[PDB]
Amino acid sequence: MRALLPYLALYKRHKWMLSLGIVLAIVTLLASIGLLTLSGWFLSASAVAGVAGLYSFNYMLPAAGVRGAAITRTAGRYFERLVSHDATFRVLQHLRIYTFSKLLPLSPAGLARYRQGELLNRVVADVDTLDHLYLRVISPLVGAFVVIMVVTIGLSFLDFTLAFTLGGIMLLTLFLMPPLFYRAGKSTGQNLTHLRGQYRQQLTAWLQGQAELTIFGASDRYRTQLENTEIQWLEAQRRQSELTALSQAIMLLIGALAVILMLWMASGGVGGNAQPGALIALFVFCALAAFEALAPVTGAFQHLGQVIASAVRISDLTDQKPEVTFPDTQTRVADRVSLTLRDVQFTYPEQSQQALKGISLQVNAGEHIAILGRTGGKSTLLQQLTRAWDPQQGEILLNDSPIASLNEAALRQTISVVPQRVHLFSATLRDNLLLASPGSSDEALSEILRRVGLEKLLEDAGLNSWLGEGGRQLSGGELRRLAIARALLHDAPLVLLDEPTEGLDATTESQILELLAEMMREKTVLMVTHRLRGLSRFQQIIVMDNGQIIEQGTHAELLARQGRYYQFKQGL
Amino acid sequence: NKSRQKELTRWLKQQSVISQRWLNISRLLGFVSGILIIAQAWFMARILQHMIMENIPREALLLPFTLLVLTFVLRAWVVWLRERVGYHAGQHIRFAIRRQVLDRLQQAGPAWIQGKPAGSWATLVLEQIDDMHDYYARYLPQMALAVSVPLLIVVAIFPSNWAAALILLGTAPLIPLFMALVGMGAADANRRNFLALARLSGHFLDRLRGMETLRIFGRGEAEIESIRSASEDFRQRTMEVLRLAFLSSGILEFFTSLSIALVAVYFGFSYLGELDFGHYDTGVTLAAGFLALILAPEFFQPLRDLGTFYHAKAQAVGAADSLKTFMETPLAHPQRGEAELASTDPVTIEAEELFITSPEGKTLAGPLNFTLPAGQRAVLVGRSGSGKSSLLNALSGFLSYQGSLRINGIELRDLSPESWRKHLSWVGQNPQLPAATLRDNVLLARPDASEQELQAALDNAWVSEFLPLLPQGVDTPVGDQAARLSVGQAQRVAVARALLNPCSLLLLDEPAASLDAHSEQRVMEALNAASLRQTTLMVTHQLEDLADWDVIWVMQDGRIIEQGRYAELSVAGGPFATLLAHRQEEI
Numbered sequence A: 001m002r003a004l005l006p007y008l009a010l011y012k013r014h015k016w017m018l019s020l021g022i023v024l025a026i027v028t029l030l031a032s033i034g035l036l037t038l039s040g041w042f043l044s045a046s047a048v049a050g051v052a053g054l055y056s057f058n059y060m061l062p063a064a065g066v067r068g069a070a071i072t073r074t075a076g077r078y079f080e081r082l083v084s085h086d087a088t089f090r091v092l093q094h095l096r097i098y099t100f101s102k103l104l105p106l107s108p109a110g111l112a113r114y115r116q117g118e119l120l121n122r123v124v125a126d127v128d129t130l131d132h133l134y135l136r137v138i139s140p141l142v143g144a145f146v147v148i149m150v151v152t153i154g155l156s157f158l159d160f161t162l163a164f165t166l167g168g169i170m171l172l173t174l175f176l177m178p179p180l181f182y183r184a185g186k187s188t189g190q191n192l193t194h195l196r197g198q199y200r201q202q203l204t205a206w207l208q209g210q211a212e213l214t215i216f217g218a219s220d221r222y223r224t225q226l227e228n229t230e231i232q233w234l235e236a237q238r239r240q241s242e243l244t245a246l247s248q249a250i251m252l253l254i255g256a257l258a259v260i261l262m263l264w265m266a267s268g269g270v271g272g273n274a275q276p277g278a279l280i281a282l283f284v285f286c287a288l289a290a291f292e293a294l295a296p297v298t299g300a301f302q303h304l305g306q307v308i309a310s311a312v313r314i315s316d317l318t319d320q321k322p323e324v325t326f327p328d329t330q331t332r333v334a335d336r337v338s339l340t341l342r343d344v345q346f347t348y349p350e351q352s353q354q355a356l357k358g359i360s361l362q363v364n365a366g367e368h369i370a371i372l373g374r375t376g377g378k379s380t381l382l383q384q385l386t387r388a389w390d391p392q393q394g395e396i397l398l399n400d401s402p403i404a405s406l407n408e409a410a411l412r413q414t415i416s417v418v419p420q421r422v423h424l425f426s427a428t429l430r431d432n433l434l435l436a437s438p439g440s441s442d443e444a445l446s447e448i449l450r451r452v453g454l455e456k457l458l459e460d461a462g463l464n465s466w467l468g469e470g471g472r473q474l475s476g477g478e479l480r481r482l483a484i485a486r487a488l489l490h491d492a493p494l495v496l497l498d499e500p501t502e503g504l505d506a507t508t509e510s511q512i513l514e515l516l517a518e519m520m521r522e523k524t525v526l527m528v529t530h531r532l533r534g535l536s537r538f539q540q541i542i543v544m545d546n547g548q549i550i551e552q553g554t555h556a557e558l559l560a561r562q563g564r565y566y567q568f569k570q571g572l
Numbered sequence B: 001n002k003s004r005q006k007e008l009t010r011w012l013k014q015q016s017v018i019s020q021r022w023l024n025i026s027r028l029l030g031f032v033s034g035i036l037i038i039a040q041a042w043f044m045a046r047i048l049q050h051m052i053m054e055n056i057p058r059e060a061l062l063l064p065f066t067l068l069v070l071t072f073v074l075r076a077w078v079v080w081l082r083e084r085v086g087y088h089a090g091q092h093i094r095f096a097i098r099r100q101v102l103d104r105l106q107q108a109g110p111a112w113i114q115g116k117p118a119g120s121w122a123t124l125v126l127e128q129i130d131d132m133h134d135y136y137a138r139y140l141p142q143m144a145l146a147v148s149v150p151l152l153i154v155v156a157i158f159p160s161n162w163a164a165a166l167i168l169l170g171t172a173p174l175i176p177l178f179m180a181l182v183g184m185g186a187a188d189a190n191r192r193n194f195l196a197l198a199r200l201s202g203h204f205l206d207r208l209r210g211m212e213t214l215r216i217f218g219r220g221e222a223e224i225e226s227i228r229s230a231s232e233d234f235r236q237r238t239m240e241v242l243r244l245a246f247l248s249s250g251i252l253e254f255f256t257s258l259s260i261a262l263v264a265v266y267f268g269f270s271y272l273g274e275l276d277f278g279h280y281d282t283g284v285t286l287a288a289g290f291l292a293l294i295l296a297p298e299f300f301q302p303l304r305d306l307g308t309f310y311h312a313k314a315q316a317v318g319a320a321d322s323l324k325t326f327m328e329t330p331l332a333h334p335q336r337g338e339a340e341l342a343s344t345d346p347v348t349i350e351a352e353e354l355f356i357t358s359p360e361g362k363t364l365a366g367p368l369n370f371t372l373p374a375g376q377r378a379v380l381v382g383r384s385g386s387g388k389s390s391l392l393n394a395l396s397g398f399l400s401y402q403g404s405l406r407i408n409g410i411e412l413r414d415l416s417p418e419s420w421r422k423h424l425s426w427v428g429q430n431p432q433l434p435a436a437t438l439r440d441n442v443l444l445a446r447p448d449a450s451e452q453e454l455q456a457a458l459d460n461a462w463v464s465e466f467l468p469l470l471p472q473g474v475d476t477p478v479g480d481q482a483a484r485l486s487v488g489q490a491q492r493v494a495v496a497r498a499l500l501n502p503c504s505l506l507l508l509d510e511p512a513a514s515l516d517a518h519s520e521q522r523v524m525e526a527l528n529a530a531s532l533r534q535t536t537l538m539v540t541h542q543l544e545d546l547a548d549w550d551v552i553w554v555m556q557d558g559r560i561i562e563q564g565r566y567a568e569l570s571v572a573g574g575p576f577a578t579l580l581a582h583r584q585e586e587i
C-alpha cells in the first residue's frame, strides 16, 4: 500500500477535479437514498393523516423535496460521470509524462534486461491501471464511507440506537467484507494468473513446434497436456466465480438483515416516541436504499491489489540509476569534429576472454573511416560514442576534448547516427522527418526526400501521409533511405553508421554507399560494417578481429600488401 | 457493416447451443428471482401497513416476518445459483470453441501456422475466446431478466392500481425513444472522432518503443510536449463521445427518478384526497403504495445492469469477427492416403512437375524435375524467396502438390502421413524445442530409448560439450522462448534428436545458418557424417564447402535451373557462380 505513494502525489496536481468528482458521487448517492426514504415517509405520513388532515398536513414541502431529490439524483449522476472521467484523463496525461520522463535517461541500458515490446506493452498497461486507482478504488471506497456516515448522523436525530445499528451494519461490511473476500480470493488469483501463463507458454510451444511435433509423432501427446492445463485453468476460473457468487449472495443477506432489524427494532419506537406511524418507513426505506452505496465496494478492494501490483512494476523500472550523467556546461557546438580513441573497449569481452587491448584509432576531421568486423564484431562504438553507457576502460575524445565534457544538448548535436533498427514513428512524414531538424522548413524536407531517392513517398500529399502503425509501411531499403534522410537533415560534423547496408539487395545498396560519398563528403563519417561493396572510397579501412586491430590503411594500400583484408577480398 | 453484424450475432447465438441447458436454467432462475422480488416487496408492504395503519405490535407479525426472512434467503440463493449457472454457460462454450480452433489449427499443420506470429495465434485462442465469456455468462442471462422482471412488476402492481403500473409501463416506450434519439447524435461524435482516436490511442506506445531514436536525436524533451499535446487531444476528443454516452445512461436514471417521484406524489396525494383516479373504487391503501414504491426501483434495475453488461456484447462481437473469419477460411489440406512404406531404408525419391501450393492456394514452387536415388546426399542452394524450404515442407507432408512426387516409387499424396513420418527426420531453420527439459527434447522422437543409444546419440552431436556448463545437467529446464540454451546450444540438441532414430530420409532447412562460429563447426560436421547413412536433402546458404555432396540443385523463383557436382558449376559462369560471388562479397 506504500508502493502507491509516488503516484498518489501525482494526484495533488488535480486535487480539485478529483475531489469534486467524489463529492458529486456522494450527493448523487445521498439523493438516491433520500429520494426513496422521503417517498417512503411521505406515503406513511399522508396515509396516517388521511382525508381528515388534508389541510393540517403540509404536503407541498415533501412534494417539493421528492422533486428536488430526483433532479440531483439524475443530474448528479451525469456530472459525476463527466467530472470523474475528465479528472481521470488528466491524471493519465500526468502518468504518461511522468513515466516517459523517468524512462528516458535510462533508455538504452535501463531497459536492456527486458524484451522491448513485451516490456513496453506492460508499461502501457500498468500506466492504464494506475489510472484506475481513482474511478475503481478511491471513488467507490471514499464515496461509500461518507455516505454511511451522513445517513448515520442524519438518522441519529431520530434515534441513536437505530442509526448506529443501521450504520454499524453498513460500516462493518465496508471494513470487513472487502478485505475478507480479497483474502479468500488471493490463493485462486495467484493460481489463475499462473495457469494462464502456463497455458500461454504451452500453446505457443505447441504452435511454433508443430513441424517437429508431427514428424516426431508427439503432437497429440503435447496436445492432451495442453488441454489438461486448460482444464486446470477453467477450474480456477470456476472457483473465482464461485466466490463472486458468494460475495453477491452474502451482500444481499446483509442488506436483507438490515431491513428486518429496521422493521423489528423501529416498531418498538424511534426515540422516545413509541408506536411511531411514519417513522418506521423512514428507517426501513433508508435501509432498503442505503446498501446501494456498498454495491461496488467489494470489487473496488479487489482492484486495489492490481493497482498496487502495477505500482511496483512502474516504480522499479523508473526508479533505476541512469548509466550516464551529462554535465551542464553549455558548450557551443563546433564544426569539424575529429574523433580520437585511446584503449577503448570495442566489444565487451566474451566471458572475460582477456584484457582486450583497446582500439586506439584516430580519425581526422574529414576522414571517412570504415571498421570491417567479423560476423557477430558487436561494435559498441555506436553505443559508447552516443554515451549509452560509460566505457569502463580507455577514453574517448571528440575534437581533442573528452566525450564526458559535452552536455547532452551538444553531444546529440555534434553526432549524427543511423542505426540498424530504424524506427518508423506513427506520425506523419513531416513529423517523422522533423525528428531530425525541427527548424527545417517544409521545402527543405521535400528536397532531401528527393536527394536521397524517396520520391515515391511524396505522392498525393506524401508529407502529410501517416506512416508507422496504422499507416503505410516502409520495407527494408525504404527505411534505410529514411534513416539517412534524418542524418542528412540533422547535419552533424561526425556521422556514425551502424550497418548502413544489411539485408539490402546489391542493386539498392550501391545507391546507399554512393549516397554517402557526395552527401557526406565533408563529414567525419565512421561506418562499421561486415560487407565489402564500396570500401574503396573509405579512407583508412580497419579490419577487425576480437577487439584488436590487425591492419589499417587505404583500400589500395591495404590490398597491395598481403594481409587479413586480402583474404577477405578473394575468397574466405 | 450491419449486414455482417446480423451474421456475427447469428454466429454468437449459434455457438451457444453447446451450453443450452445452462442458458435455460439461467432464464428460469431470472423468472423466479422476479417472483421473489414481488413476494419480498409484498411482505414488507403488508408488515409496514399493520404497524403504521393498524398499529399491530411486532410480536403479532411473526408469520409475515418468517415469510419475509424466507424470501430474502431464497432471493440470495437464486443470486448465488444464477451466478454459478451463468459461468457454466460461458465456460462450456469457450471450451468447445477453443477445441474447434485448436483442431482447425492442428489439421492446417505447420504450413498455415507460420502465416502469423506465434503471439498472434495466442491472442485468438486466449484473449478472443475468453472475451466471449461475459456475453454468455452475463449479457445473455441479463437480457432475459431484463424483460421478465420488469413485466412481473407491472403484472403484480396492476391488480392494486392501474395508475401505479401505468407510471412504470409508460416509461417503457419512452426510454428507447430518447435513448435512440440521443444515441444517433452520439454516432456522429463517434464517427468524426473514430480515426483521430485510433491514431492517438497507440501514440504513447509508439513514442515509448522509439525512445532510443529520440535519445540519439535529442528529442526526448520535445516528446513530452507531444505526449502532453496528444493527451489533451485524446481527452477533449473522447469527452465528446462520453458527454453523449452518459446522456444515454442518464435517460434511464431520469425515468428511474421520475417514476419513483411520481409514485410517491400520486400515492401521497391520493391518500390525502387530491387525486381520485387510478384505483378500482375500492380505495387506495398504504400497503398498495409501499408495494409500488419498493418495486419502482426494482423495475429499472434489470435495465440498469443490462447497460453495464452491454459492453460485453461489443467485445464478444469483436471476438466473433476474427473467430468466424478464421473458422471459415477455405484453405485445403494435403490428402492423407492409406498406402504405407515398409522399406525402412534410404528412399529413391523423384518428382516431376510438382507445382507446390500453399494452404491458401498460392503456388510456391514451379515445375520441379529431379531424381534422387537412395542414399545420395543432395543439397539445395539459392537466394531467399526461391522456395528452397517449400520443397522440404512438401516432402514432410505439410504442403499439397499438383504433380508426381513418388517416394520409393509410391506417390506421396497416396502415402499415409502417419507412417511416412517414422521414416523421416529433419533439422529446422529455427530450432523449436516443444518439450520442457533438455533430455525430453532429445528423446522426443523415441519416448523411451535405450540409455546407451541415448548416450551415444547426444555425445555424437556434441551437446555433451556444454552439458557441464548447464546448471542441472541433462535434466535442465529449457524454458519457452528463453535463453536457458542459446542458439548454439539449442541447435545441437535439435540435431541430437534428429539423429537419435534411424530414418529413410533426412531434410535440413538451414542448420548452422544463424549459429555461432564454434557451434557451426560442431553441428555441421555431425550432420555431414550423418548424411552418408541415408538419402539426405539439405538447404544451405554457405556455398563454400559442398564438394562432397552429389548435386547442387540451385533454383530461383521456384524452379531448379542448374544441376551437377560442385566442381562442374563452380566456375561454369552460371547463376550459381554469381550466387557464390554474393556469398564472398560479405563476411
Ligand SMILES: Nc1ncnc2c1ncn2[C@@H]1O[C@H](COP(=O)(O)OP(=O)(O)NP(=O)(O)O)[C@@H](O)[C@H]1O
Pocket (backbone or CB within 6 Å): B111, B112, B114, B115, B358, B359, B362, B364, B382, B383, B384, B385, B386, B387, B388, B389, B390, B391
Ligand atoms: N506457408 C506459406 N504460405 C504462403 N506463402 C509462402 C509460404 N511459404 C513460403 N511462401 C512464399 O514462398 C516464397 C518463399 O519460399 P520459401 O520456401 O520461404 O523460400 P526460402 O528460400 O526457404 N526462403 P528463405 O529461408 O528466407 O531464404 C515467398 O513468396 C513466400 O511468401
Ligand SMILES: [Mg+2]
Pocket (backbone or CB within 6 Å): B388, B389, B390, B429, B509
Ligand atoms: Mg527457408
